[PDB]
């Protein structure tokens, strides 16, 4: 695991590279203009899409209203289900 961490990358780069070469491919990236917040990006059927992902002062990450210990506890359990719930896009890496 951990093949999904790309760090410094921006949205404009992410939408470029992440179209290679399968739907459900994903990367995790920072807000380079002001560090400490992050984005998930994913390959979808019309292009590439993005999702803001954060942590609290409690040192716990969140996506919804519910908290998890790291983004690894999101990704490793979210992967069996859709990021959209209206499209067949699920997180996958080979």
PDB file of C-alpha atoms in Angstrom:
ATOM      1  CA  UNK A   1       0.000   0.000   0.000  1.00  0.00           C
ATOM      2  CA  UNK A   2       0.885   3.719   0.083  1.00  0.00           C
ATOM      3  CA  UNK A   3       1.394   3.947  -3.734  1.00  0.00           C
ATOM      4  CA  UNK A   4      -1.266   6.704  -3.753  1.00  0.00           C
ATOM      5  CA  UNK A   5       0.732   9.471  -1.927  1.00  0.00           C
ATOM      6  CA  UNK A   6       1.926  12.127  -4.469  1.00  0.00           C
ATOM      7  CA  UNK A   7       2.312  15.147  -2.061  1.00  0.00           C
ATOM      8  CA  UNK A   8       3.253  18.479  -3.794  1.00  0.00           C
ATOM      9  CA  UNK A   9       0.984  17.867  -6.888  1.00  0.00           C
ATOM     10  CA  UNK A  10      -1.743  20.426  -7.887  1.00  0.00           C
ATOM     11  CA  UNK A  11      -5.287  19.828  -9.371  1.00  0.00           C
ATOM     12  CA  UNK A  12      -4.088  20.931 -12.907  1.00  0.00           C
ATOM     13  CA  UNK A  13      -1.287  18.327 -12.877  1.00  0.00           C
ATOM     14  CA  UNK A  14      -3.607  15.664 -11.243  1.00  0.00           C
ATOM     15  CA  UNK A  15      -6.305  15.945 -14.027  1.00  0.00           C
ATOM     16  CA  UNK A  16      -3.422  15.562 -16.592  1.00  0.00           C
ATOM     17  CA  UNK A  17      -1.605  12.461 -15.265  1.00  0.00           C
ATOM     18  CA  UNK A  18      -4.420  10.541 -13.486  1.00  0.00           C
ATOM     19  CA  UNK A  19      -6.306   9.787 -16.750  1.00  0.00           C
ATOM     20  CA  UNK A  20      -3.552   7.079 -17.165  1.00  0.00           C
ATOM     21  CA  UNK A  21      -4.781   4.322 -17.740  1.00  0.00           C
ATOM     22  CA  UNK A  22      -7.845   3.009 -15.769  1.00  0.00           C
ATOM     23  CA  UNK A  23     -11.028   4.305 -14.037  1.00  0.00           C
ATOM     24  CA  UNK A  24     -10.810   4.300 -10.173  1.00  0.00           C
ATOM     25  CA  UNK A  25      -7.080   5.163 -10.145  1.00  0.00           C
ATOM     26  CA  UNK A  26      -6.394   7.756  -7.430  1.00  0.00           C
ATOM     27  CA  UNK A  27      -3.794  10.112  -5.839  1.00  0.00           C
ATOM     28  CA  UNK A  28      -3.481  12.067  -2.550  1.00  0.00           C
ATOM     29  CA  UNK A  29      -2.060  15.637  -2.735  1.00  0.00           C
ATOM     30  CA  UNK A  30      -1.496  18.787  -0.634  1.00  0.00           C
ATOM     31  CA  UNK A  31      -2.637  22.440  -1.112  1.00  0.00           C
ATOM     32  CA  UNK A  32       0.860  23.680  -2.259  1.00  0.00           C
ATOM     33  CA  UNK A  33      -0.121  27.423  -2.010  1.00  0.00           C
ATOM     34  CA  UNK A  34      -0.874  26.917   1.765  1.00  0.00           C
ATOM     35  CA  UNK A  35       0.163  23.517   3.264  1.00  0.00           C
ATOM     36  CA  UNK A  36      -1.702  21.375   5.878  1.00  0.00           C
ATOM     37  CA  UNK A  37      -4.920  20.574   3.927  1.00  0.00           C
ATOM     38  CA  UNK A  38      -5.204  17.865   1.238  1.00  0.00           C
ATOM     39  CA  UNK A  39      -7.145  16.504  -1.761  1.00  0.00           C
ATOM     40  CA  UNK A  40      -7.985  13.091  -3.049  1.00  0.00           C
ATOM     41  CA  UNK A  41      -8.261  12.915  -6.889  1.00  0.00           C
ATOM     42  CA  UNK A  42      -9.773   9.945  -8.854  1.00  0.00           C
ATOM     43  CA  UNK A  43     -10.235   8.808 -12.503  1.00  0.00           C
ATOM     44  CA  UNK A  44     -13.968   8.934 -13.431  1.00  0.00           C
ATOM     45  CA  UNK A  45     -15.925   8.119 -16.697  1.00  0.00           C
ATOM     46  CA  UNK A  46     -15.941  11.766 -17.970  1.00  0.00           C
ATOM     47  CA  UNK A  47     -12.341  12.659 -16.833  1.00  0.00           C
ATOM     48  CA  UNK A  48     -10.781  13.180 -13.338  1.00  0.00           C
ATOM     49  CA  UNK A  49     -12.569  14.349 -10.117  1.00  0.00           C
ATOM     50  CA  UNK A  50     -11.481  15.668  -6.659  1.00  0.00           C
ATOM     51  CA  UNK A  51     -12.450  15.437  -2.948  1.00  0.00           C
ATOM     52  CA  UNK A  52     -11.130  17.665  -0.082  1.00  0.00           C
ATOM     53  CA  UNK A  53      -9.763  15.581   2.897  1.00  0.00           C
ATOM     54  CA  UNK A  54      -8.568  17.051   6.228  1.00  0.00           C
ATOM     55  CA  UNK A  55      -7.455  16.536   9.876  1.00  0.00           C
ATOM     56  CA  UNK A  56      -8.474  18.179  13.150  1.00  0.00           C
ATOM     57  CA  UNK A  57      -6.370  19.506  16.068  1.00  0.00           C
ATOM     58  CA  UNK A  58      -7.120  16.042  17.644  1.00  0.00           C
ATOM     59  CA  UNK A  59      -4.610  14.514  15.058  1.00  0.00           C
ATOM     60  CA  UNK A  60      -7.537  12.605  13.426  1.00  0.00           C
ATOM     61  CA  UNK A  61      -8.566  12.832   9.763  1.00  0.00           C
ATOM     62  CA  UNK A  62     -12.109  13.414   8.359  1.00  0.00           C
ATOM     63  CA  UNK A  63     -14.030  13.332   5.034  1.00  0.00           C
ATOM     64  CA  UNK A  64     -17.656  13.184   6.239  1.00  0.00           C
ATOM     65  CA  UNK A  65     -18.874  14.196   9.777  1.00  0.00           C
ATOM     66  CA  UNK A  66     -17.075  11.013  11.087  1.00  0.00           C
ATOM     67  CA  UNK A  67     -13.330  10.745  12.055  1.00  0.00           C
ATOM     68  CA  UNK A  68     -10.548   8.179  11.351  1.00  0.00           C
ATOM     69  CA  UNK A  69      -6.952   7.802  12.647  1.00  0.00           C
ATOM     70  CA  UNK A  70      -5.241   8.271   9.227  1.00  0.00           C
ATOM     71  CA  UNK A  71      -6.251   8.455   5.550  1.00  0.00           C
ATOM     72  CA  UNK A  72      -5.073   4.787   5.397  1.00  0.00           C
ATOM     73  CA  UNK A  73      -8.159   3.821   7.536  1.00  0.00           C
ATOM     74  CA  UNK A  74     -10.348   5.694   5.028  1.00  0.00           C
ATOM     75  CA  UNK A  75      -8.784   4.222   1.852  1.00  0.00           C
ATOM     76  CA  UNK A  76      -8.376   0.561   3.003  1.00  0.00           C
ATOM     77  CA  UNK A  77     -12.126   0.314   3.989  1.00  0.00           C
ATOM     78  CA  UNK A  78     -13.778   2.832   1.536  1.00  0.00           C
ATOM     79  CA  UNK A  79     -12.274   0.954  -1.524  1.00  0.00           C
ATOM     80  CA  UNK A  80     -15.082  -1.699  -1.571  1.00  0.00           C
ATOM     81  CA  UNK A  81     -17.692   1.122  -2.273  1.00  0.00           C
ATOM     82  CA  UNK A  82     -18.226   4.052  -4.714  1.00  0.00           C
ATOM     83  CA  UNK A  83     -16.818   7.591  -4.157  1.00  0.00           C
ATOM     84  CA  UNK A  84     -20.003   8.843  -5.995  1.00  0.00           C
ATOM     85  CA  UNK A  85     -22.785   6.298  -5.028  1.00  0.00           C
ATOM     86  CA  UNK A  86     -24.183   7.240  -8.523  1.00  0.00           C
ATOM     87  CA  UNK A  87     -21.095   6.128 -10.640  1.00  0.00           C
ATOM     88  CA  UNK A  88     -19.000   2.816 -10.580  1.00  0.00           C
ATOM     89  CA  UNK A  89     -15.808   4.751  -9.516  1.00  0.00           C
ATOM     90  CA  UNK A  90     -13.992   3.028  -6.599  1.00  0.00           C
ATOM     91  CA  UNK A  91     -10.443   3.573  -5.307  1.00  0.00           C
ATOM     92  CA  UNK A  92      -7.962   0.993  -6.852  1.00  0.00           C
ATOM     93  CA  UNK A  93      -4.123   0.815  -7.309  1.00  0.00           C
ATOM     94  CA  UNK A  94      -1.862  -1.906  -8.947  1.00  0.00           C
TER      95      UNK A  94
END
